[PDB]
């Protein structure tokens, strides 16, 4: 489409990240307020999650049990909210530095973009040791997103490309993305289509599977894109950070 949607949350300041459910309820982390507020389906108007104590959060995750996950940036730590709890817990990540992001599956596995220490780590559910994984020379990873088949994308944000690693895989693949400038923020669907917010060039790409065809999609009015997710009918949604804003656009 060429119709863009500013969601009606308010009062918001740097926002850095957002996650959308199957049921489209969208949470994003409101970086320089400290907090994370959602947009229940359905709702005009926003909630405030019950963390405590966030630092700049930087990244949010949320899977099919509404659980969410945060990373609280600014205390180098991960917090989890379950759905109707009113206390979080702190994830067994160790020496984590100013993390940027994260992404869940439906197993309960936890990725992070270990963005201080240039590397990406998982816990599997009920770890209670990190794995790194083998990426190499990633510099301030800021962004992650996760597949259904445990396909891990980090945006490596200083040099400006896209890798992943399949289930499985010990060798990093580069994305042929090309232009990128500081990105900060990958999404993908289970059509193998993977989406950056391309955060110095102002603008979000999209990589067609297969073809590796990139294209720049109609948004308008965007300054220093910080995020990104999408659904399974292509609806993406960016944290329109430099504008204190959040806007979607519809497939096509």
């Keep these: 489409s060429n119709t863009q949607t500013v969601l009606p ?6 926002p850095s990240g957002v996650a959308v459910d199957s049921a489209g309820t969208v949470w994003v982390t409101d970086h320089g307020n400290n907090r994370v507020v959602k947009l229940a389906a359905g709702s ?20 099919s049990a509404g659980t969410v996950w ?31 992001g994260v992404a869940v599956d439906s197993a309960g596995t936890v990725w992070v973009t270990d963005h201080g220490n240039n590397r990406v780590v998982k816990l599997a559910a009920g770890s209670n040791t990190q794995t790194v994984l083998p990426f190499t020379g990633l510099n301030t990873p800021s962004g992650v997103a996760v597949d259904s088949a445990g396909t891990v994308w980090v945006t490596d944000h200083g ?7 399949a289930a499985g895989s010990n060798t ?18 289970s059509a193998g289509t993977v989406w950056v917010t391309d955060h110095g060039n102002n603008r979000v790409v999209k990589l067609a599977a ?5 294209t720049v999609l109609p948004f308008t009015g965007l300054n220093t894109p910080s995020g990104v997710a999408v659904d399974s009918a292509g609806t993406v949604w960016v944290t329109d950070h430099g504008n204190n804003r959040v806007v979607k656009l519809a497939a096509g």
Aim: glycine share 10%; net charge positive; proline share 7%.
């Design 9 to 14: 949350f308010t009062g918001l300041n740097t």
């Design 44 to 63: 005009n108007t926003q909630t405030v999650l019950p963390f405590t104590g966030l630092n700049t959060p930087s990244g949010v995750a949320v899977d």
């Design 70 to 100: 945060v990373t609280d940036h600014g205390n180098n730590r991960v917090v989890k909210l379950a759905a109707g709890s009113n206390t979080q817990t702190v994830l067994p990540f160790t020496g984590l530095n100013t993390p940027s």
């Design 159 to 165: 040099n400006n490309r896209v890798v992943k690693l």
């Design 172 to 189: 990093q693949t580069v994305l042929p993305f090309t232009g990128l400038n500081t990105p900060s923020g990958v999404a993908v669907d």
């Design 210 to 214: 297969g073809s590796n065809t990139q």
